[PDB]
């Protein structure tokens, strides 16, 4: 119902905020090297398990894709342990950021494209629990 859906959405908003804190480091890496950072340390951000909050367990950087993982003990059943991603694409004076269900990038260096995450049993936050500003499909432009 509406109380539950609100609770979940509010919790997911914290994951987005924590993931957004990594954007500047990820972009800087890309501009410095002409390719995305493979991992958190290369990007100059904290190890993933240190990027945490009340409702957020971790934030991982993998080939420039920033993926947040919800906690399990104090979040809504439907989002426990589930994930969302942020990723960027060059516009050729700046980058544009995207946010939605989890994605991956196979290589650090191709139109900056990403693909929908393929891990079997996928733990993707349901669309209804994503903010209106975080519903991009993997193929969005
Ligand atoms: Cl937990």
Curated annotation (Swiss-Prot):
Q: List the disulfide bonds.
A: 99-134
Task: Identify the main location.
Answer: other
Q: What happens when the gene is disrupted?
A: Deletion mutants are unpiliated but nevertheless form biofilms showing that attachment and accumulation of cells did not depend on pilus expression.
> What's a GO biological-process term for it?
cell adhesion
What PTM annotation applies here? O-linked glycan has been reported to consist either of the Gal(alpha1-3) GlcNAc disaccharide, or the Gal(beta 1-4) Gal(alpha 1-3) 2,4-diacetamido-2,4,6-trideoxyhexose trisaccharide.
Keyword Nucleotide-binding attached: no
Where does the record place it? Fimbrium; Membrane
Query: Mind listing the UniProt keywords for this protein, alphabetically?
Result: Cell adhesion, Disulfide bond, Fimbrium, Glycoprotein, Membrane, Methylation, Phosphoprotein, Transmembrane, Transmembrane helix
Taken from the UniProt entry, a GO cellular component term is:
membrane
Which residues are glycosylated according to the annotation? 42
Q: Which top-rank group of organisms is this from?
A: Bacteria
Q: How does it sit in the membrane?
A: Single-pass membrane protein
Residue numbers bearing the O-(sn-1-glycerophosphoryl)serine modification: 72
Sequence similarity:
Belongs to the N-Me-Phe pilin family.
Q: What does this protein do?
A: Major component of the type IV pilus (T4P) that plays a role in cellular adherence, microcolony formation as well as twitching motility.
Q: How does it assemble?
A: The pili are polar flexible filaments of about 5.4 nanometers diameter and 2.5 micrometers average length; they consist of only a single polypeptide chain arranged in a helical configuration of five subunits per turn in the assembled pilus.
Record protein name field? Fimbrial protein
Lineage, top ranks: Bacteria, Pseudomonadati, Pseudomonadota, Betaproteobacteria, Neisseriales
